[PDB]
Write a protein that binds this ligand. Sequence first.
Ligand SMILES: Cc1cc2nc3c(=O)[nH]c(=O)nc-3n(C[C@@H](O)[C@H](O)[C@@H](O)COP(=O)(O)OP(=O)(O)OC[C@H]3O[C@@H](n4cnc5c(N)ncnc54)[C@H](O)[C@@H]3O)c2cc1C
Length: 483
Amino acid sequence: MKHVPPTVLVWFRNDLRLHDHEPLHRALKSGLAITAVYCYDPRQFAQTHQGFAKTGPWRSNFLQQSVQNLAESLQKVGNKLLVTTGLPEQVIPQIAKQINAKTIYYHREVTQEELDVERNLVKQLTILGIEAKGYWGSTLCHPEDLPFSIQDLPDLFTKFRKDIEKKKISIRPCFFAPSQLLPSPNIKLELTAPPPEFFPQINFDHRSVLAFQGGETAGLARLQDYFWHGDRLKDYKETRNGMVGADYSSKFSPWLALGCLSPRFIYQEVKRYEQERVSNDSTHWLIFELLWRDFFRFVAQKYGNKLFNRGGLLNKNFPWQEDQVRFELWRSGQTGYPLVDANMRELNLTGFMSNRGRQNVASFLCKNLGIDWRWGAEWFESCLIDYDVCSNWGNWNYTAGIGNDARDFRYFNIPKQSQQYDPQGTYLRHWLPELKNLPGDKIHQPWLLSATEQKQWGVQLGVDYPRPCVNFHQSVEARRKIE
Ligand SMILES: Cc1cc2nc3c(=O)[nH]c(=O)nc-3n(C[C@@H](O)[C@H](O)[C@@H](O)COP(=O)(O)OP(=O)(O)OC[C@H]3O[C@@H](n4cnc5c(N)ncnc54)[C@H](O)[C@@H]3O)c2cc1C
């Protein structure tokens, strides 16, 4: 009965921030009262094909904290975040009709699940005579500024990278976070708080690289610490392949995945750092990594569902084992290969794994165990606190040899990698307590321990730590034999 003035609605998904947010910026420039909404989608809390929770505890809790921080940032600027649950394509249009929204502003995604949601949502808006404005803001490089169409995206990262830089594409400046956002008059809406079961209680492990806190505020603080307070960006290139501690890399991933941090804002800060403190290979290398992120997003956009097919991007068959027992050995980190086990346990207990670790465990599953690569991609999807559909599935495709041609079989020598990237065994002892008594480099290959060593050091293979589940050289040559 009360008068409901026309308004605009900003729909949030994986862009939980107020800074450099084009949809939000365009909305406020309309000059109308703004309503903000986040809708927890039950489908994201169901399961993957092999049964894993689609959104595990590490990420669901990080998400809840990110949504909560966004609600607090909006309250701070005199507005509020409407939080509800259900199918967005159903809920958002319902809210829009009720609040008399004239337009919905949102960020566009590129993968099937996300694409169907926004597509069906817009269809409902169109039926109601409500406009929908979507923007591209997930990538460092705007799709419209690329020297080529998505369909023409080069298949080699190097060419992609060289083409964009050797063209001076230029990065769009960041939009400013608003200090005030006019809210519409109070309107009674039926909002459903998300079910508690979506966020199972978490047992934080202090061995974690970081006490990850979801949200834009925590994301900005982390950048502040890594870049400025700690002044460690200058050494990024030298420490990026590390595995122990919070500072061997930015740890920006979970915040970038939910859009708590804009990649263009990070880029902006890298440039500030380069001008104020130092410009070297490290400062440039971090940008290279953001480009890899962009690349996989465009690859996912270009290839669509092929990204999730058995044959991946290259549509290459390859036989794969469906050994559930061996897979659980991998997932639980009881393969008998310390580098792999330490990494898998870190993931299981913290939701995070270093890039160097991810490359090795993925290779071990595909090349050494020869198990359906998708099973590994699914576990990462479930367990990773920084899961990004494009980067995860894209990287798994490459590792499995179904994404990047490269006329040559490729595998990681786990035992070699272990000694090279954890020369003192620090990472290993950090995550594998049972091997803490091993004082020497045999910690990298415990199967080399003599009967005397196993007894003296209290490490009985088969009891305290598992025997290698596979012969390394043999497994590699066997999987390769699949020509
Ligand atoms: C099997 C496998 C699965 C992966 N799954 C994911 C995933 O779900 N989500 C995700 O964000 N990354 C994934 N990656 C890349 C991964 O290594 C993470 O980016 C992580 O290591 C980031 O930690 P950091 O933020 O400290 O990285 P930094 O080294 O500090 O790099 C900074 C940012 O660059 C981006 N980046 C770095 N390396 C890559 C890369 N290889 N591909 C894409 N972006 C990259 C990330 O957004 C990252 O936050 C995967 C890699 C492999 C080999």
